Design a protein around this motif. Structure first.
Motif, PDB file in Angstrom:
ATOM      1  N   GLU C 101       0.826  -1.198   0.000  1.00  0.00           N
ATOM      2  CA  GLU C 101       0.000   0.000   0.000  1.00  0.00           C
ATOM      3  C   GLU C 101       0.864   1.254   0.000  1.00  0.00           C
ATOM      4  OE1 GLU C 101      -3.597   0.320   2.465  1.00  0.00           O
ATOM      5  OE2 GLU C 101      -4.312  -0.400   0.510  1.00  0.00           O
ATOM      6  N   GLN C 105       6.850   6.672  -6.400  1.00  0.00           N
ATOM      7  CA  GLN C 105       7.972   6.534  -7.329  1.00  0.00           C
ATOM      8  C   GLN C 105       9.175   7.242  -6.725  1.00  0.00           C
ATOM      9  OE1 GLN C 105       6.649   6.662 -11.716  1.00  0.00           O
ATOM     10  NE2 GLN C 105       5.116   7.954 -10.706  1.00  0.00           N
ATOM     11  N   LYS C 134      11.970  -4.964 -10.548  1.00  0.00           N
ATOM     12  CA  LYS C 134      11.070  -3.963 -11.117  1.00  0.00           C
ATOM     13  C   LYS C 134      11.533  -2.548 -10.766  1.00  0.00           C
ATOM     14  CE  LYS C 134       7.323  -7.058 -11.808  1.00  0.00           C
ATOM     15  NZ  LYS C 134       7.944  -8.183 -11.057  1.00  0.00           N
ATOM     16  N   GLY C 135      12.822  -2.291 -10.919  1.00  0.00           N
ATOM     17  CA  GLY C 135      13.353  -0.984 -10.601  1.00  0.00           C
ATOM     18  C   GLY C 135      14.679  -0.759 -11.263  1.00  0.00           C
ATOM     19  N   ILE C 136      15.147   0.478 -11.241  1.00  0.00           N
ATOM     20  CA  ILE C 136      16.425   0.814 -11.853  1.00  0.00           C
ATOM     21  C   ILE C 136      17.451   1.028 -10.766  1.00  0.00           C
ATOM     22  CG2 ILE C 136      17.420   2.090 -13.763  1.00  0.00           C
ATOM     23  CD1 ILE C 136      14.478   1.111 -14.130  1.00  0.00           C
ATOM     24  N   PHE C 154      15.341   2.774  -8.142  1.00  0.00           N
ATOM     25  CA  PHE C 154      14.252   3.720  -8.322  1.00  0.00           C
ATOM     26  C   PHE C 154      13.064   2.889  -8.739  1.00  0.00           C
ATOM     27  CE2 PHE C 154      11.720   6.491 -11.183  1.00  0.00           C
ATOM     28  CZ  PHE C 154      11.267   7.364 -10.216  1.00  0.00           C
ATOM     29  N   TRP C 156       8.572   1.771  -7.501  1.00  0.00           N
ATOM     30  CA  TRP C 156       7.447   2.020  -6.616  1.00  0.00           C
ATOM     31  C   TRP C 156       7.875   1.496  -5.261  1.00  0.00           C
ATOM     32  CZ3 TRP C 156       3.252   4.905  -7.686  1.00  0.00           C
ATOM     33  CH2 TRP C 156       2.970   5.166  -9.033  1.00  0.00           C
ATOM     34  N   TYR C 287      -4.512   3.275  -8.358  1.00  0.00           N
ATOM     35  CA  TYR C 287      -3.898   4.592  -8.261  1.00  0.00           C
ATOM     36  C   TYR C 287      -4.846   5.559  -7.567  1.00  0.00           C
ATOM     37  CZ  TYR C 287      -1.202   2.423 -12.022  1.00  0.00           C
ATOM     38  OH  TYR C 287      -0.452   1.556 -12.783  1.00  0.00           O
ATOM     39  N   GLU C 294       0.695  11.346  -6.149  1.00  0.00           N
ATOM     40  CA  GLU C 294       0.128  10.160  -6.779  1.00  0.00           C
ATOM     41  C   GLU C 294       0.711   8.920  -6.115  1.00  0.00           C
ATOM     42  OE1 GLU C 294       1.031  10.551 -10.915  1.00  0.00           O
ATOM     43  OE2 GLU C 294      -0.570  12.010 -11.295  1.00  0.00           O
ATOM     44  N   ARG C 296       0.200   4.511  -5.312  1.00  0.00           N
ATOM     45  CA  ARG C 296      -0.258   3.275  -5.930  1.00  0.00           C
ATOM     46  C   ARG C 296      -0.287   2.167  -4.892  1.00  0.00           C
ATOM     47  NH1 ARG C 296       2.961  -0.340 -10.433  1.00  0.00           N
ATOM     48  NH2 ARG C 296       3.964  -1.017  -8.491  1.00  0.00           N
ATOM     49  N   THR C 297      -1.384   1.418  -4.867  1.00  0.00           N
ATOM     50  CA  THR C 297      -1.485   0.187  -4.097  1.00  0.00           C
ATOM     51  C   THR C 297      -1.372  -0.981  -5.067  1.00  0.00           C
ATOM     52  OG1 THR C 297      -2.763   1.060  -2.234  1.00  0.00           O
ATOM     53  CG2 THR C 297      -3.034  -1.275  -2.769  1.00  0.00           C
ATOM     54  N   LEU C 298      -0.348  -1.803  -4.869  1.00  0.00           N
ATOM     55  CA  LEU C 298      -0.111  -2.929  -5.749  1.00  0.00           C
ATOM     56  C   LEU C 298      -0.593  -4.226  -5.135  1.00  0.00           C
ATOM     57  CD1 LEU C 298       1.602  -5.271  -7.222  1.00  0.00           C
ATOM     58  CD2 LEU C 298       1.124  -3.228  -8.570  1.00  0.00           C
TER      59      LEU C 298
END
Ligand code: GDP
Ligand code: GDP
Ligand code: GDP
Ligand code: KF0
Ligand code: KF0
Ligand code: KF0
Ligand code: NAG
Ligand code: NAG
Ligand code: NAG
Ligand code: NAG
Ligand code: NAG
Ligand code: NAG
Ligand code: NA
Ligand code: ZN
Ligand code: ZN
Ligand code: ZN
Ligand code: ZN
Ligand code: ZN
Ligand code: ZN
Lengths: 555, 555, 555
Positions: C101, C105, C134-136, C154, C156, C287, C294, C296-298
């Motif tokens: 939750e 970013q 899932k990131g840089i 970097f 979520w 979102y 902004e 985001r809950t994934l």
């Protein structure tokens, strides 16, 4: 009754010891067999073929970076940010997007796209619903900016519909994304099921046409390059790409082969008209409550929709299909018989001897086909009441008059000429006058005038000596001893007395003359005796107190 | 060996110069050929037919207005507000909706739908999960309003499940919406691909059955009206409509025709039971965080799900299919032969002459079939050891006794009657007593009693003169000169001395009698000589110091 | 011309009154007919079969409870909380979930999953995109917690990717959920349409294989148990289950049967490698705007995707298909003829009499096949210029010399032996010397030396008496009266004068000798007279002032 069932009919055949015909027959048989076997094997016509039922599971891997604006905004895109939950036969990857944040249902000017400007309130309609602008017009032209004005519309505002897709595409790095495709196929009728991934497969592999054709991991850029498509350009407006998985599966144990073949094909037209929505895109709405108002962020997402098309058939040996194919192809083995019989019939014709053979002497040895034809076919004619056969001593052949006699004398009638069969040398290797008469021994018929032309026949067509003058006529026809011998052969205990013996002898003389001058019993039974010979026979065995019936139709 | 391969067998045939039979044969041949060609052409059985693989891309255009409430709320609906992101074989358009805003996971009364009321806490269950109410009951009946009370449930509250769909449908204007369908079809086996939109197509067109059958732009109201469906009524509860695209594609160059045919069909049952979820609807949840709490807006959306069904086949000429069809249909060309042979066999039977012909004289001329049958078939019987042929001078026919002789004299046995073949007129056109005896010249057999009934045969069935009394018997059978001539013909340098010549002459006399009284060698080889003739022959050529073997089985 | 069209050819046949052959023929005919009918009926080969087009509508019912945490959170899950809007051929039911939750970013440590730890900043890459995390990456190793450190990325944040699915599955109660499936199938070619639910069906039913096989309401746990699958275990990581609906539909009115058959099959591999994403799961993003940011809950949702696979065919009677099948199977009715003809040909061979019959006396009675063969086939040879037939009085057979004579005398040549046909007993039942010579009456040929070996033939192969010494030679060959009688039979008015009569008599004598010593005219026409007989004939009818041409090729 019972014996009728217990019968078998076998065709009478003539075998020819001919090198040419045997060679032709065997060559044609081998050709037919070879073609039939090649077709059966090439098309697997012995196999019942079934379509597959397929399930597809897709997994997209990839992370994208964006640095776009009025402040410079840094953004990270993962699978949840550019993929929809659907993971079946089709999956969509976002490659570009237009963002309109904080939309509210209210009035606003429409975006000035492709000559959307207005110069007066009256110009723009009121209450007209414009799917292009996605709003309802209020009939007013309002200033979108300082220089241009656009019609007011009730809609989600601000409205950016008509804005061109950003170039270059923001999510170009999607070309580096990978997709893993798991395909499970089943042939329900053949009770078979398999999948595109089997134990022992490399997990670090990436698909290639030659090096790794079985790797189910595909790079999108590689997919586009395999078929000469530019991912960078398509990313701007999007498109549709189809990943075809073909299953040419053989389920026979001795020839088991069920492997997928991967191919790619662009599914969206590259040259679509600008008015028909070129590329692939859709609008994605995110609704949120700010303070106490409902607001919407609209994303115009352009991307590539990947359609995974799975097709193929599974073939398994079936006895019924093989039997049907063999039955269908069996009749082709009569080609040799048909061709050789046609050759025999064609080369038996006299036409080739008179015309073809003198011109071409190479086709001369094929005159033997006349012997084959005469040994193969026995021509016969319909035994109708009008059938008549006449022979003239001067002429060497016989004439068949099958036409009704409408008063014209049978001698005058011409008929059609037919040959005289050989008289079985094996059995032979032993010890004034009427106008139509040309022999001087004929007499007018005593039959009714309505049927008198039948007996108005002479032994010859031209003046000369009568056939009766020959000694063979007396030996064969008028020889009482010979006729008595024949009758005794037929009737050993015959009584040689009375007028019955005279009638029997007259009939035997008629038969003897017919056989002598016509040979074949088929023609003899329908022959017509000349008046001279008929009346000489009757004078040898006169009928006491009766009238001669003459020729009678056997049937 | 080698000559065995170099052989060809051709069937012996009889050709009949008959107008009726030739006409029937040609008519049947033409009928069979016409039907075969019509089928081949009508069903394209020369074409290998393949199913298509299809991709569908849909674009919905339309804007809707709503004015619904407690304050009057004005709402604008665009594609993002009534369409889901999916744009493939199926797309959904919202036509009505029920909104429940600001839901929280807590306790609340359940909506009183279809007798959902309760009158006591004990009546409602505790912990029971109700998919209808979508909540877990707490076992209490609480007041939904002043007048009615409903059971408490833990769920998203407020709960409106069970509320009837608004009537009239809010998004009725969806009937005016348009959908553009792009269909790409491929026949992977035929290496062919096409699409439903081609260059030069009108972009302002709308689909019509007759005026514009190829326009891929469809109005939903027009879709419903084309098949007599009321969009206004269906919009209230929703439904499913299928847009069928049929591809009857011919890929032959000379007959290339690959065009889509559009049709519509309602897919949801109009009379579905109220308990089976009539219509089409689904619940769409929008989650948002207000203050510090998670809230949900639930939309019960009713609409029409448009299923785009694409099917068809592509046919391309295949040599193997044509060959298979021709082979299958070849055997039908024997129908003429079968029918004409059946006619010949049926009309050859004597039954028709005795019964059918007198009753009907029109079928009389068909008596010629007897001649055809006798010229076509040669009946023969199995030459078994029990086969015997006997001829009586009084009787005109022959008898075939093929039964074992169990002591009963052969004369007493009856057998079955068979006709006597004609004796080749062509070759013939030349110069006290035992109880069973009826001629007075027979003698008892000298064979063993176990096989004596074979020779217990007389020349006649009734008293009379013996066949031996005829002069032909002496001329043919007992004539030593004739038998010597025959033997010399067979053996030119035969030695006419010793008992060997006597045995040869006796055998020749037996053969001569058998041929004279039985004609056919097939019957003669199995004939049985009468005792009188047998013993007269033996008396003419007695055996010096031996016992006569009698008849011997040739095989 | 016209009569050529009006012809019919019928095969000449021999019928055999044989019990064995008739029984075999009828048995084979019945076997072929029975198999053909069984196939046609079993495979419905008279039916044109069509694939169906299907539409599926699914409705999931069920409510789930969760009590999960740092505070204990009570949660209610309804259809909108665990089902996606899609309700077609596939529907997904959530069985487990991982929640992250309030994602933003920004930078954060990556979750330490499967050896993801780092011990130095340099170890982790900078700018590397990791689809697993899932990131840089920023190239730094930062402390995820007190004990372990993970590379910064970097993304979520917070990032929980790699976390194991909770065990036991939170939404285990999904096993108690129900699904109603409505399937509409159409056979567009047969103009037929039906659905899996018909009036009068129980609405409280649940599907069972035996008790309620037609109930379209399925319990998910029951689905899993029907095929031995554990729903509780699969719920942890998810999977794919296929619900197969098979339509074996017969559309014939007299045999109408179109009912669905339901089956279940796991579609995801149970033993998938851990690196190939075992099970079924996807990431769902919610979102929302909090304050002015902004977030985001994934949701990592694991569940079972239910793929509804509909397949089948509809069969309807077609005349063309039945005609094609009958034509294909017609040729199989010749099996009886083929087998019986093969038996006749095989048992006619002499080989079986010399070898097989003495060894096995049971196959002795089948010697009758020689009679059938001789009554069925008439062997002939190609009448080529080199064909020659020679007979020797000492020998009982004839020799066929078909080889060119390259100077070697015809007597020296051996040829191949052939039998002498029977001389038609029916028609017969009437009243010094050269080196190669063995009879003392032959003379050297007067022909050119290049063709003199043809006439260098003697009447016998060993010394002895000449055939001319026999009286039959004078009676048949040199009898002027007999030859004159034959010529008169052929030419009744022949002139018995001049050298023409002498030439005719010489030719008749040649023919008489050839017929006497060769019987068949086929062999007689190619026979070669011995020098002795030839020169005796010429001495009886000398040619005045000419040279004898000798044998001439008929063709
Ligand atoms: N083929 C043929 N048969 C004939 C001819 N004349 C008479 N007959 C046969 O002889 C029979 C009649 O004999 P005929 O002496 O003419 O009359 P009859 O004295 O009353 O018996 C019939 O059955 C005819 O088939 C003829 O010219 N040709
Ligand atoms: N068809 C037929 N053939 C017979 C008859 N009697 C004898 N033969 C034949 O004549 C041969 C025997 O001759 P026969 O004088 O009876 O005895 P043999 O003196 O020992 O040779 C056998 O091969 C028989 O086929 C008979 O009644 N009918
Ligand atoms: N089969 C056969 N025919 C022969 C033989 N010699 C002559 N001929 C036939 O008799 C004809 C020639 O007769 P010949 O007396 O030899 O010569 P000619 O006097 O010129 O006619 C030819 O047509 C031959 O077919 C022979 O040895 N065998
Ligand atoms: C533009 N974005 C941001 O600024 C933050 C991330 C991104 C965004 O909003 N993702 C929403 C989303 C989730 C799943 C699938 C899709 C699809 F349409 F591409 F398929 C989308 Cl758009
Ligand atoms: C009732 N509404 C309002 O007040 C504001 C607009 C509308 C609403 O909430 N749209 C959400 C949405 C987005 C895409 C597809 C669908 C579908 F289910 F119809 F397919 C839906 Cl419902
Ligand atoms: C974990 N949850 C909560 O705490 C509150 C309820 C639930 C949640 O967020 N539902 C969102 C949702 C809506 C439709 C389909 C799906 C699917 F992915 F399962 F298919 C999902 Cl996840
Ligand atoms: C894809 O990856 C390669 C290697 O990391 C990189 O050079 C290339 O720029 C990437 N593509 C895009 C569009 O960023
Ligand atoms: C692909 O498209 C991009 C942008 O449209 C362009 O810069 C590039 O040159 C193209 N490449 C090819 C090979 O066409
Ligand atoms: C559809 O459009 C026509 C013409 O603009 C209009 O008359 C009609 O009312 C519209 N339908 C609905 C349901 O609003
Ligand atoms: C269609 O339905 C609407 C509302 O249900 C009704 O008012 C209208 O009369 C119907 N039209 C027809 C043609 O049935
Ligand atoms: C399913 O329902 C039965 C009966 O109500 C219950 O015993 C069982 O525990 C339920 N299953 C789960 C997983 O809760
Ligand atoms: C099913 O799985 C659960 C959890 O994995 C386990 O407790 C249970 O024993 C399993 N049942 C069977 C029959 O394997
Ligand atoms: Na056939
Ligand atoms: Zn005359
Ligand atoms: Zn005359
Ligand atoms: Zn007697
Ligand atoms: Zn007697
Ligand atoms: Zn000699
Ligand atoms: Zn000699």
């Amino acid at each position: 009754s019972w014996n009728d069932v217990f019968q078998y009919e076998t065709n009478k055949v003539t075998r020819i010891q001919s090198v040419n015909y045997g060679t032709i027959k065997w060559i044609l048989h081998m050709t037919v067999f070879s073609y039939v076997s090649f077709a059966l094997m090439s098309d697997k016509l012995y196999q019942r073929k079934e379509p597959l039922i397929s399930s597809v599971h897709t997994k997209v891997k990839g992370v994208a970076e964006v640095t776009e604006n009025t402040k410079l905004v840094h953004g990270i895109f993962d699978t949840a940010d550019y993929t929809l939950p659907l993971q079946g036969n089709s999956f969509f990857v976002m490659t570009n997007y237009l963002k309109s944040e904080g939309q509210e249902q209210k009035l606003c000017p429409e975006y000035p796209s492709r000559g959307k400007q207005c110069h007066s309130d009256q110009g723009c309609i009121k209450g007209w619903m414009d799917p292009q602008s996605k709003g309802i017009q209020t009939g007013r032209c309002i200033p979108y900016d300082q220089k241009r004005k656009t019609c007011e519309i009730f809609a989600w505002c601000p409205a950016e519909e008509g804005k061109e897709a950003p170039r270059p595409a923001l999510l170009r790095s999607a070309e580096n994304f990978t997709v893993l495709i798991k395909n499970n196929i089943d042939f329900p009728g053949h009770n078979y099921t398999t999948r595109n991934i089997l134990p022992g497969m490399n997990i670090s592999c990436t698909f290639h046409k030659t090096w790794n054709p079985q790797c189910p991991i595909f790079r999108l850029g590689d997919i586009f390059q395999e078929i000469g498509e530019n991912f960078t350009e398509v990313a701007v407006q999007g498109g549709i790409m189809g990943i075809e998985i073909y299953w040419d599966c053989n389920l026979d144990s001795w020839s088991h082969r069920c492997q997928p073949k991967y191919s790619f094909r662009r599914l969206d037209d590259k040259y679509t008209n600008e008015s028909l929505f070129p590329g692939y895109n859709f609008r994605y709405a995110k609704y949120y409550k700010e303070n106490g108002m409902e607001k919407r962020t609209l994303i115009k997402a352009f991307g590539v929709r990947f359609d995974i098309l799975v097709f193929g058939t599974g073939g398994k040996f079936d006895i019924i299909q093989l039997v049907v194919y063999i039955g269908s192809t069996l009749s082709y083995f009569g080609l040799a018989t048909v061709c050789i019989d046609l050759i025999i019939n064609t080369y038996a014709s006299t036409c080739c001897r008179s015309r073809v053979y003198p011109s071409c002497k190479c086709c001369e040895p094929c005159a033997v086909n006349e012997y084959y034809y005469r040994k193969k076919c026995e021509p016969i004619v319909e035994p109708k009441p009008t059938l008549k056969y006449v022979s003239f001593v001067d002429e060497p052949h016989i004439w068949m008059v099958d036409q009704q006699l409408l008063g014209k004398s049978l001698q005058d009638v011409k008929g059609q000429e037919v040959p005289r069969p050989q008289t079985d040398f094996l059995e032979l290797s032993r010890l004034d006058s009427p106008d139509w008469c040309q022999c001087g021994n004929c007499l007018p018929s005593q039959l009714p005038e309505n049927r008198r032309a039948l007996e108005e026949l002479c032994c010859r067509r031209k003046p000369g000596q009568c056939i009766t003058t020959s000694e063979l006529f007396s030996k064969i026809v008028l020889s009482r001893e010979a006729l008595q011998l024949l009758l005794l052969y037929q009737e050993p205990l015959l009584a040689l007395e009375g007028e019955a013996i005279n009638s029997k002898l007259r009939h035997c003389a008629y038969r003897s003359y017919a056989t002598w001058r016509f040979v074949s019993q088929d023609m003899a039974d329908f022959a017509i005796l000349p008046s001279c010979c008929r009346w000489k026979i009757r004078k040898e065995f006169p009928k006491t107190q009766g009238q001669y019936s003459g020729f009678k139709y056997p049937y």
